[model samples]
Target: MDETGKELVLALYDYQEKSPREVTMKKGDILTLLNSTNKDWWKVEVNDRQGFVPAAYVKKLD
Candidate 1:
């Protein structure tokens, strides 16, 4: 990971009556840094999904 990189998970939306509306993620998924307005939060890109995650949740790889 780069000094600016972080680990994230990809969320997939399933289409079914019992399927989840919001997908969950695990660690080590590929994520790109989109922006960070708050030091405690970061905007990231998980594949095609984009959202904000707590910076504390991410480990500074570098």
Candidate 2:
């Protein structure tokens, strides 16, 4: 089903933040999308933590 109002994204693998201002994503983790100013990076929030993650690591459900 196509979605137009949801903001959830699924992480493809575990991603550890190697620097400041970046967020970590665990495999199969679901994150809420906040922003996508850059295709290489996306602003998201998970587990009460907010930051940026690589867009390639997540898939947006449409």
Candidate 3:
């Protein structure tokens, strides 16, 4: 993913391996891209939880 301002919403969380208690996200959630590194990944904040997300799910805004 390029370095840009975008709002990426969490469409769904695959909690198959672990239970919901282990995972941090849920369906139909919104996250913020605080920063990014390398490419195709970003540091995001979801429900006050911090983690990395793929740029594919992120939607760019003008």
Candidate 4:
């Protein structure tokens, strides 16, 4: 959403029915937010395998 494609960062495990097309994450996993036109769901990329994840699961990365 800014220069260098930096968007959001993983805060913690997105459990409790937060995600649907989750692409799986790890500690300090810095992901690139692809599309954010949706309401709750967001398309992100981690390891070449891009999928939709809950927006609440991540935090703004600077």
Candidate 5:
């Protein structure tokens, strides 16, 4: 576990997590960037829920 609890990203579009391993998010939702090992799918946390989402769906905030 690395310390990266402060990095944040903003959702660029609405995404409904279709699998149990994924997390749903809405457009403009802010989330914590947990992991970015895979550029196509990155892990994020929002409102206590954690899962993988399309990397293209989010943009780093600063």
Candidate 6:
């Protein structure tokens, strides 16, 4: 999935705090898709901070 430069909005949340990745957030948060090489995860950004989220939960532009 080549989601680079794309935008993904958070629709729901069950995201546990990933200590190693330092990625965590609540529902309704917006994130930009930085990378999506991993099938189970994606590199995203919210505010000025970066985070990792599942690819399935990230929605298209709304």
Best model number under TM-score: 5
> Model 1, 53: alpha-carbon shift in Å?
0.3
Clashing pairs in 4: none
- Candidate lDDT (C-alpha), each: 0.51, 0.81, 0.53, 0.66, 0.85, 0.67
Clashing pairs in 6: none
Q: Write the per-residue lDDT of candidate 1 for residues 1-62, one digit (tens) a residue.
A: 54555543232322111223222335654556767789875676654555666666565443
Worst 10 residues of 4 by lDDT: 11-20
Per-candidate TM-score against the hidden true structure: 0.54, 0.80, 0.49, 0.65, 0.86, 0.63
**Higher-ranked by lDDT: 3 or 6:** 6
Question: How far off is residue 62 in model 6, in Å?
Answer: 6.0
Model 6 Cα lDDT, one tens digit per residue, 1-62? 43445556674675656675746656777667787788888788765667677877767575
Top lDDT prediction, candidate number: 5
Candidate 4's C-alpha lDDT?
Answer: 0.66
C-alpha positional error of residue 27 in candidate 6 after TM-score superposition, expressed in Å: 0.6
lDDT of 4 by residue, 1-62 (tens): 45536666564554332355568766567777778878786777766667777777777577
Number of backbone-clashing residue pairs for each candidate, in the order shown: 0, 0, 1, 0, 0, 0
In model 6, the worst 10-residue window by lDDT is: 2-11
lDDT of 3: 0.53
Q: Candidate 2: list runs displaced more than 4 Å.
A: 1-5
Q: 42, model 2: CA deviation in Å?
A: 0.4
Tens-digit lDDT string for candidate 5 (27-60): 9998888888898988898677889998888998
